[PDB]
Amino acid sequence: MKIRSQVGMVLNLDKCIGCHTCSVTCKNVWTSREGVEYAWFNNVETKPGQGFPTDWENQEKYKGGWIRKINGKLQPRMGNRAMLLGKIFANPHLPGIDDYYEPFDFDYQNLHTAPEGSKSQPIARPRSLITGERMAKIEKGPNWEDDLGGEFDKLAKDKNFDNIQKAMYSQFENTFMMYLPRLCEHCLNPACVATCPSGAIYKREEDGIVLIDQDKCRGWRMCITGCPYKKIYFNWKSGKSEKCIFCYPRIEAGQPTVCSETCVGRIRYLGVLLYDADAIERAASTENEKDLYQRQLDVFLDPNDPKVIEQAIKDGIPLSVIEAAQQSPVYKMAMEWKLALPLHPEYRTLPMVWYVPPLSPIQSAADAGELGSNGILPDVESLRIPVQYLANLLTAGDTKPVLRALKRMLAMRHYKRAETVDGKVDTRALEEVGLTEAQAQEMYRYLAIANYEDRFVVPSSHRELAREAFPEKNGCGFTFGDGCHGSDTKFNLFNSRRIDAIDVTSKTE
Amino acid sequence: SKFLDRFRQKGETFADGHGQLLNTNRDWEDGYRQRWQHDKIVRSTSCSWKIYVKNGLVTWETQQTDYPRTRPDLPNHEPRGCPRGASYSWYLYSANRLKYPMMRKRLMKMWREAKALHSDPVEAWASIIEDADKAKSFKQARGRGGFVRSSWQEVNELIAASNVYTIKNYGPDRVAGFSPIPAMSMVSYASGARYLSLIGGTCLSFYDWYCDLPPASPQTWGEQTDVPESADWYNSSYIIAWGSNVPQTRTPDAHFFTEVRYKGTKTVAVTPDYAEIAKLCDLWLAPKQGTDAAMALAMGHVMLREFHLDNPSQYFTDYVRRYTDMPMLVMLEERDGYYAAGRMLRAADLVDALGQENNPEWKTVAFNTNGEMVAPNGSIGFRWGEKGKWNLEQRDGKTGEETELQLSLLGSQDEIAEVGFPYFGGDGTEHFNKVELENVLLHKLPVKRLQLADGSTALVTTVYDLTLANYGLERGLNDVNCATSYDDVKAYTPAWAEQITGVSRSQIIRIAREFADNADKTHGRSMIIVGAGLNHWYHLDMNYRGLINMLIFCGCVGQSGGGWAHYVGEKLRPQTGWQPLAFALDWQRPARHMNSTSYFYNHSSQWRYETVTAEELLSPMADKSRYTGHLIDFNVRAERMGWLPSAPQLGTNPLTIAGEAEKAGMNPVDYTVKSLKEGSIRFAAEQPENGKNHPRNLFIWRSNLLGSSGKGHEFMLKYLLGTEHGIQGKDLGQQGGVKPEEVDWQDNGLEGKLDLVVTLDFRLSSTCLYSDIILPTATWYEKDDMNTSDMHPFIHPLSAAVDPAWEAKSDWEIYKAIAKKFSEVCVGHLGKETDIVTLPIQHDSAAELAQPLDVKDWKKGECDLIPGKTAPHIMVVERDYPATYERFTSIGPLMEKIGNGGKGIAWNTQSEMDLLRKLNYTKAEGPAKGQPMLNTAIDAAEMILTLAPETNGQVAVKAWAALSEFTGRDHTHLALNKEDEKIRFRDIQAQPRKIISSPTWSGLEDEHVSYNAGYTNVHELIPWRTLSGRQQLYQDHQWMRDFGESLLVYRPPIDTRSVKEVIGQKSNGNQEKALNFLTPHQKWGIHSTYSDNLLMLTLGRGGPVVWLSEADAKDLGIADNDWIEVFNSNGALTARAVVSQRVPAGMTMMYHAQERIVNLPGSEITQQRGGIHNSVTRITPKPTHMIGGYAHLAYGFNYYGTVGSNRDEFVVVRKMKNIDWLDGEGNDQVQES
Amino acid sequence: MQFLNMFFFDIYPYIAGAVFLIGSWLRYDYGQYTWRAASSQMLDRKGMNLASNLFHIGILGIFVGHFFGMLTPHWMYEAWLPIEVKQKMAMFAGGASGVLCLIGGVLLLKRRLFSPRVRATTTGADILILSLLVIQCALGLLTIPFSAQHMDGSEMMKLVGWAQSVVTFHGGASQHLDGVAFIFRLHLVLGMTLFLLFPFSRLIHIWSVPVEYLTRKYQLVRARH
Ligand code: HEM
Ligand SMILES: Nc1nc2c(ncn2[C@@H]2O[C@H](COP(=O)(O)OP(=O)(O)O)[C@@H](O)[C@H]2O)c(=O)[nH]1
């Protein structure tokens, strides 16, 4: 029983407007450099579709995530240590640049320097950012399928359509689309870590953020295949891989991530989760994938249980981290209300970025309809987005927890209408899904009103603990290049000393 | 040593040896921390963004989340923002950034060679422009490269030289500037406008031009636009998003819509395609595009039936009684066996004139519940000429006593007359369904006979009865045209609309029923968000009136959480504090405002290709031979009748008119009228090609006019610029059609009219590309300015995060310098001149009560030319040309002398000025000595803030006081508890400030109620600036009744006949096909801005693209991303296809503004560079939008006038074959099959 | 000639060995961000599977042979592994590895130079380094027909003698080469030159062979540091 904390994220898909603001803000800050210009740590995808990279969800082709052997043990679908080591001179599964899109730019300067007397109006044509050559035609982008852009037969190739008769959805009246914004999951049992030969990828103990150490990474490029969400991007220029860093620089001080603070749809929730690190393998190795979701929930710990508080303390969790853990919106949605679900729990990584499924217009039916158990509002059975589709995406094929979520979302709508239109207290809907008046009220508070202070509850990473903040405060930033950062042994070949350090030791003890 | 570290650290394992805690170095993490850290943050932007500077450069931006929080029971605004907004930072040092003033080489060569022969710049300009081979040698260079680096010193001089030369020979109104949406940057827009206003140049409009202006609004409420704020959406329990792609186009506010769904609110999306908006609703109805009025009619029908007749609603009934013109009495005209509804009955028509001696002919009449006839309060007549009677208290305007108007005559009529109503549901093209009934539908209306004050007898009935009649409600009089059941196919039944729209009748019924039930239950909390989906069709008025009637029948307007929510391109709230700065009304009155659609229709000569004839738009009950001519003829008439503005106004330099009058021994005013009658002086409009009645100098800033908003791009390029174009059809001349009967014709139209086109921008846009001079302006991150919005009540700033880079300058500094140079270069050419300025009859002014009973053309001798009544005013404006720069940079005296005001009221603002003198300091000496200064943008902003009621609680109270006179009701309480409030530019810099409630608007800034349009009308009984003073369902103006729009009626999309003459004419070998060409606002830009931004381009498809349904795409052999060509009579465009299922067969969408500078290959139809979306559209004005001098239908800059509708358009689509870039690169392609 | 003889085989090897060692260390302590294999696979997967595997598996056979071949003393299985048996093993086993390497090497070089994406993003050292190894491998194979003339191992005995003198710091190591065919001299010089150019190229990935991975725990967590 080793309790550890992490700030997880819950995205409410019901409110996502598919604007991409999140993707841009991240790109401006973290990935505008040459080498990672095609990488989108946060990218939104329209579904049905094959996503970015193309068909990333197809683990039979890309070999991501884990598999559970017959002996019950866990093994990267890429292969065991030797199998993986043997694919090093050429990762046979590695996704190629074209799988993303060839990053392009346009020749704007032609608009300015076009010489006098041009036969035709000057123009700015596309150009490869990889070769610098003229591109005859832009044939792909990172958000190319945006808003059902592309023939249905192409889009329906979407892996989540497996086991569903998709013929009916190609019909106009049955059209449906939703948005899937995604970043790195910052898993509890991450596959990338297990698939990096040099040991350069690690999970931070204090906040559970997973990072690729830019000093130690050797560019063995195996991790890319190991990540089933394909959220690690090879930086073609530096030779090392980079990934979403969960904005740790801000998180460390108790701020939201850029893609969270800038979400226009006010759909992202940041809250602490306390997990037993000792149960990771046991939960992730459960025999039936339809049990991974539940088994993960069991790995989370009740921040209000004193038994957990004391173990947390005992285990080094800062008081404030424990405090915020008890006011965590992420906990309320994944644990109490059961509205948040994991993304592809079947990859056995124990993902930490969850989603609330979206509602949708009721399906097309013969007559204009009849009042359901929810009156003029929809019944979960009438929603047009096929529940099995959602289940393939969030619950390993199990429609039960998906319906529960949707049904409760709708229940709240029914209880609130009775209250604000009829002025009556009606809990028929609530009683049917097993919710209390209080819980629906709290659901409304967080989901509907979503005050900034309720959407984001991020504690400090306490960088003062186990280190020496004082000399850092005083000398951090002066990047004159003292050649001594990054190593514990003081001795160095250039005969120098750390600028943010004290080398004249006290003699008064 | 990192090498020595290896030889050293493994802590405990966990998860049964599945894991290992390592105690190892993590200093490498500083790397990403060092990227995040920045030099500081600055607030700028309708969303406050934090600008992050780092290494002394702007590196990125994020949303400010410190807006003042809203009531606890409402979600807050933070963070707002959008994807376009988040990418702005890119522009600053991008490869498309304009760094220096640029000039066309050919023009620079002739300019320097001229200056060497003419020491005086004006003469040097005169030498080039007056030479036909010189003029044309650089006009043809337009859009064909050649830009060279120039200097501020050079361009400023050339510009002023050209401006002086043009004002001096042709006149000030031959100089113009186009700038849009001022709310985006009040001062940036005001800069060019102030300079143009001072020198007498014309200031073109934009709201009507973009077709963002909903004519139905001025029609029904006599207000251009006022709507509830997005926060208010949260107080609605039933919402319909009709033709409004909210999440994509109203991104920062969408959350109020997705969040209110959790409060129990039901939502419905009405779109022909599965739009992003559908994704967030409870129901999706997909009518055939352009057939919405129908559906709205059937819903209104069901409502009237079930909520007004079968089971009457206490709330809806009282509401329509006290707030609409339904009880008002309409006169019936006589016909061949039936009657037609005529003008409304005016108190005048009655013998005693109902006691009303002041404007009796402008007062409406109804019947109280005692059968007595009365002229109730609020009618427009009581607005001017008298006091305390322009309110909405249900009182007898004669005895000042509480009465009660009755709605239906039925049950007390003298007889049952039969009235004819026009029906167009049977006309239309082949692409839309039609229901055949009768061009005229006869209904049995309960009437009554009255004895007119002139002996004659006449029949009357109410707007109310006339309405139920027009909707098809059987009321007992056994009418063969009314409905027996919703299933009965009649004049606007659910079954009827199911055939037109394709939406099951059961749906029309269910929703109509829920919508109304909710409004009854909550007392008006049903709202309808509507956008360009409906407002960009030729018959936008019908779509909006359809939506409006449903809302009025359910008493939703004026109720928090209910109403008509129109959102498009924003809202400059502190108006009256900005109008004087932007149009220099503090120095001279008035300025030259112009409605741009008529302007371009005329000068880009798009009228010479007209295919639409007014005839085919007349009511079947109208004197066809009493409405003849080209649509442009109606405009010329409207202009000389004082209805619409003119530009250029007169066919003779207006600066020389004063001098000629003095030699005539009469004043300029009377001398002009004499001449106008005698034919001495003519309206320039009558002869737009004579050679002196066309604009010569055009300024464009904060716009991409020639590459975006410019409808009829090829016509614009041919006649306004004089370059090659892709127009495909022949003109009226070449075809043989009939010439207008008010305009000179000429087989070979005048080309290249614009002598000098100056564009201000920070990016080399499509407009810049076809310019003569590009002025490098500053981005929104390098200048100070202000912003307001329709979506919320916050006023925030734009701040320079850093100084404009390279040689950029703020729009303010740019016009300041041009003004300074104009002031010296004009010495010896223009001094203190006198200018004759025509001015159309203004709305919200006593003159709006011009022609009360009919229409009289003074040029037809039907009446006397009376400026201000049957013609525009003829004003005298003195201009101190050498004093321009000084006037530009100082606050005029007129504010102190004449005061300040708007929307009909006026107050004293002397105290404000004294305050300004203190914050802006004053002139040491010179022509404007002692006056407050206007040197910097801050000064100007403080002028707007200190002068506006919305931002100054002291001017706010003075305002309500002024209005209080008119109503007789105290309104000052609306501002009293905020009177000490004063918004300072530096204050909004630290935190966005909510504004003060003002009479300029009808919603309120309050802590218990949201800002909801019409709330002051319904709750403070303030009248709607309309004929009856109430919400006008009945349009009784001649032109409206004769064009079939007295009451709303379904109108099929029009035929632009732009396809059959060109289809197949230039086959490339691939199948061709006609498709409805819709251009809704896009997702990777705002209009044209961002359409060159790499972030947006990478998130979209990489350049211009058009969406086609799967069937249409396969029928044409088009695969996703294939190069295709869309073209018709007007021109052609090249792009790539986006094949998708969510696009209904039959239509095509090329999302609005993807412009002409990125990824466009040569067209196979014009052998030129492919065109843009507007290369296939063309202006086609509608008469009903030209009406003036009639209460709510009187003019107003951006308030009324012809609109740029274009959804009705059809194009030919086909896959491309040869893809040649025309750049000599040798990198061309060929698509097979 | 005798001057060039003592420079290249008595002095130069110590310059390249000194630069190789201290240069690797200094770049590991001050160039961590530059310590990578620099994969180009993603930019162009064509023929990379075949080509890279051929090259690496061949090059590794060489290294193993070269290593045990010349750094293993004689008295160690002087009976079971006499110098002439070692020559037969290297001529055939090491020679087959040579062909694989050379083919993969060449295919990779064809690629680096003519596949637009790899060529546009390549560095000069990537070309110089890949070219020297291809040349060095071809040289190595051309030495086989010469050694085929001394099946008694006399040639190998000379070279091995030289190598062992060098790595144990015994002067006069070049004497062991008296008589040896010139071809061998070129291979030895061009080979040592790769140790010199080593720390300034991508070859540093070699130090990073991920052997610790075969016994590491799957999950890694770094504590507060
Ligand atoms: C400084 C480093 C090197 C030294 C001292 C060296 C030395 C030798 C010697 C002495 C032989 C002939 C074997 C005998 O009969 O004794 C040989 C052969 C060969 N070498 Fe090298 N070599 C070096 C580096 C390399 C490299 C980097 C490559 C790969 C490109 C290579 C590829 C070969 C091949 C293919 C053969 C022939 C087959 C064999 O004997 O295994 N050598 N080398
Ligand atoms: N009901 C209705 N919806 C339309 C029509 N034309 C387009 N739409 C849809 O409604 C949206 C409105 O268009 P757009 O110009 O983007 O509007 P905006 O959101 O007001 O800026 C489009 O994106 C379409 O999905 C129409 O004629 N009727």
Ligand code: SF4
């Ligand atoms: S910013 Fe928020 S609403 Fe917009 S796409 Fe990203 S997650 Fe969805």
